[PDB]
Amino acid sequence: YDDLSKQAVSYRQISLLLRRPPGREAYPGDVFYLHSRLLERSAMMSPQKGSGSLTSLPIVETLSNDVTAYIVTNVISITDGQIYLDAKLFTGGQRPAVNIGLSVSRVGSSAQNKAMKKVGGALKMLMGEYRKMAGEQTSG
C-alpha cells in the first residue's frame, strides 16, 4: 500500500463532503475502522484453511520524524511490527535509512531462519553496544 496516509485524505473528503462530524486532525473518527478492515485481512491462515498467507507492507508518510501523528499511531496500533526510515540518515548517505532503535518486528523471530537467527542475535547485541558507545563519548 503506497500509501495509506493518502487513502485517509480521500475518505476525509468523502466524510466532510457529507458533513459527517469531524475529529482529530480533521478526520471523522471511523478512520481507524477504515484501516482495521484492511489490515486484519492479512493473516497466516490455519491448516484448517490451507495454511496460506496474505502479507501486507503498508507505507505511511511522517512529517519531520513525528510518529505522534494520528494516522501513524492508528497504524502502529494495527500492524504486527514497524520499520522506521529516518531522513537524517538518508541525507547522511546511509541508504536504506533504517533506524534500528525505532524499528521492531513483533513476530518474525519465529519465522527467521536459524542461519539468520543466530547472525541476527550477534548483530543485535553488537548494535545495542554501538548505539551506546557512539553517543556516550560525544567526541570526549
Binding site: 493518502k6 485524505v9 480521500s10 476525509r12 473528503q13 466532510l16 463532503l17 458533513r19 469531524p22 486532525e25 480533521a26 508518510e61 512529517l63 519531520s64
Partner: protein, 487 residues
C-alpha cells in the same frame, strides 16, 4: 440546431445558481450571460448540481448589478481557450480574452480547459534530463523532463533572470516554447515582468516571441485564480501534442493556487478539513500536476515557486506540493551578495533523478564528489574563521582552494541581461560541463587562479580570461617598470 438557455435563481457572493427546464449541463461547463445586462461579459462554470434543473456555478468576475432570473447562455462546453503560435508574446486571462490591449489574437482552434490527464499508456517511464544550459542546475539538480521543480526565492535573488534564461535556452536547445502562469500575481509584477520580456526579447513584438503569459491577478475572485494554471497548462499541451516538443510551465506561487481553491470550497460551504485548506486539497492540486507529465509525444516541465507560510514545511499546502516535486532550486540572498549569480545554494537543494539508473554514471559521481567537496568546505569554513587557514593540513587547504574555485565556477552569466550589464551569456552543454568539473576535481586544472572561474561558462572559455588576466598584469608590470625606469 439551437442553444440552451437557463435562468438565475440566487446570487451569494461569487456563487450563483441557475435553474433550467431541461437536462442540466455537465459539471465544469461554462455559462455566459451577455454584457448588456451586467455591463461586461460574464462567465460562470458549473461546479455542483443541486437538483434535476439547478446548477451551482462559480463566477470568475464580479457579479455586481446582476439581476435575478436573467437569461444565461450555455456555451455547449467548458472554457475554450486559445492555442497556437498566435498565443505567443501575448497575455491572456482565464477565459483567453487578451488583456495586453494588443489587438485580437489570430488563432485557428480553441481548446477546452479541463483536459483529462494523460493515460498511463501515453506516459514514458524513462526518466530523462532537461539540458537547461545552466551548469549549476545541470550538475547537481538535473531538471527531469515531465517533472515538477521547486523554486524558492524572495526578492533580489535573480528569480526573474533565471526564468527568462530558461525560456531562452529551452527555445534554442530543445526547440521548445514556454508559458508563464501568474496565480495571485501582484499586478505591479505583471508590468515588471512583461517589460523585462521586451528588453530581453523573450517577447519580440516585431518578431518571434517564446513565452505565453497568463495573469490571474489578485483583483480577480478565487473562481478565476483557481482556474488559471489549467489555462496556462492548456496552452502548453498544444505545444506538447500538436507541435510535438518540450515545454516549460512557470507557476507563480502554488500557495496562491491552493488558497483560491480553499476559498471556493468555503463559499460552496464545504467543511474545511484542516488549518483552513479545502478537503479536496490533494485532488485539486493533483488534477493539475498529473497533466504536467512527459509523454511519447513531448513533455511539459513545470518550475513552480512555492511559498512556505511561517517557514513550516508540515502545512498541508507545501507538504502536498512537495510530494509532487522532483527538484528544488533554492535561492539565497547570501550567495547573491557574495557575487554569485545564479544565486543557487547547491547543498540545501536536492533532486530525484540523481541516480545512475536514470543518468549516466560520470555525471553522478562527479556531482556527488562536488557535494562532498563543498560540504567539507563548509566545515573547514567553520574552522578557518575560528583557527585560521594555517591551522589546516596540506590536504585540506587544497580542497579549500578547489571548493572556492567550484563555487566561483558555478557563477554563470546570462544572455538575458547581456544588454543591461554588457557581458555575454554562455549556453554550456551537459557533457562538456561534466568534463570541466572532472578536470577541476581531478586537480588537472589547479594552476589557474580563482577569479578566472568567476562569471564564465565552460573550461574552454575561462582560459581566455586567464590569459587576459595574465596579459593585463604583465602590461601593468611593463607599464610600471618603464614608467619607473624612464624617471
Amino acid at each position: 440546431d439551437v442553444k440552451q438557455v437557463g435562468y438565475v435563481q440566487q446570487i451569494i457572493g461569487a456563487v450563483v445558481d441557475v435553474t433550467f427546464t431541461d437536462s442540466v449541463p455537465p459539471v465544469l461547463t461554462a455559462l455566459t450571460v451577455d454584457a448588456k445586462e451586467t455591463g461586461t461579459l460574464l462567465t460562470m462554470e458549473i461546479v455542483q448540481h443541486l437538483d434535476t434543473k439547478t446548477a451551482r456555478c462559480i463566477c470568475m468576475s464580479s457579479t455586481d448589478m446582476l439581476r435575478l432570473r436573467t437569461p444565461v447562455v450555455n456555451t455547449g462546453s467548458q472554457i475554450t481557450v486559445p492555442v497556437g503560435e498566435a498565443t505567443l508574446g501575448r497575455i491572456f486571462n482565464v477565459m483567453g480574452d487578451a488583456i495586453d490591449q494588443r489587438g485580437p489574437v489570430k488563432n485557428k482552434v480553441r481548446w477546452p480547459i479541463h483536459r483529462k490527464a494523460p493515460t498511463l499508456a501515453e506516459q514514458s517511464g524513462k526518466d530523462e534530463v532537461l539540458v537547461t544550459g545552466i551548469k549549476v542546475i545541470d550538475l547537481i539538480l538535473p531538471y527531469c523532463k515531465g517533472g515538477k521543480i521547486g523554486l524558492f526565492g524572495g526578492a533580489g535573488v535573480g528569480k526573474t533572470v533565471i526564468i527568462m534564461e530558461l525560456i531562452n535556452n529551452v527555445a534554442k536547445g530543445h526547440g521548445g516554447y514556454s508559458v508563464f502562469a501568474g496565480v495571485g500575481e501582484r499586478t505591479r509584477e505583471g508590468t515588471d515582468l512583461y517589460l523585462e520580456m521586451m528588453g530581453s526579447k523573450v517577447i519580440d513584438l516585431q518578431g518571434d516571441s517564446k513565452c505565453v503569459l497568463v495573469y490571474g491577478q489578485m483583483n480577480e475572485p478565487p473562481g478565476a485564480r483557481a482556474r488559471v494554471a489549467q489555462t496556462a497548462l492548456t496552452m502548453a499541451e498544444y505545444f506538447r501534442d500538436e507541435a510535438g516538443q518540450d515545454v516549460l510551465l512557470f507557476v507563480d506561487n502554488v500557495f496562491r493556487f491552493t488558497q483560491a481553491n480553499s476559498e471556493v470550497s468555503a463559499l460552496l460551504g464545504r467543511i474545511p478539513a484542516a488549518v483552513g485548506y479545502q478537503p479536496t486539497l490533494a485532488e485539486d492540486l493533483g488534477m493539475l500536476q498529473e497533466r504536467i507529465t512527459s509523454t511519447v509525444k513531448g513533455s511539459i516541465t513545470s518550475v513552480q515557486a512555492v511559498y512556505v507560510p511561517a517557514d513550516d514545511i508540515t502545512d498541508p499546502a507545501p507538504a502536498t506540493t512537495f510530494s509532487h516535486l522532483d527538484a528544488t532550486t533554492v535561492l539565497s540572498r547570501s550567495v547573491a551578495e557574495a557575487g554569485i549569480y545564479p544565486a543557487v545554494e547547491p547543498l540545501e537543494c536536492a533532486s530525484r533523478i540523481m541516480d545512475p539508473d536514470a543518468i549516466d554514471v560520470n555525471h553522478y559521481n562527479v556531482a556527488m564528489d562536488i557535494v562532498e567537496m563543498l560540504t567539507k568546505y563548509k566545515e573547514l569554513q567553520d574552522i578557518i574563521a575560528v583557527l585560521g587557514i594555517d591551522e589546516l593540513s596540506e590536504e585540506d587547504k587544497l580542497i579549500v582552494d578547489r571548493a572556492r574555485k567550484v563555487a566561483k565556477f558555478m557563477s554563470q552569466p546570462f544572455a538575458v541581461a547581456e544588454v543591461f550589464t554588457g557581458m555575454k551569456g554562455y549556453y554550456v552543454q551537459l557533457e562538456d560541463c561534466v568534463s570541466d568539473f572532472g578536470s577541476l576535481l581531478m586537480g588537472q586544472c589547479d594552476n589557474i587562479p580563482e577569479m578566472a572561474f568567476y562569471m564564465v561558462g565552460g573550461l574552454d572559455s575561462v582560459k581566455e580570461k586567464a590569459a587576459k588576466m595574465a596579459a593585463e598584469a604583465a602590461a601593468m608590470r611593463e607599464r610600471a617598470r618603464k614608467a619607473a625606469e624612464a624617471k
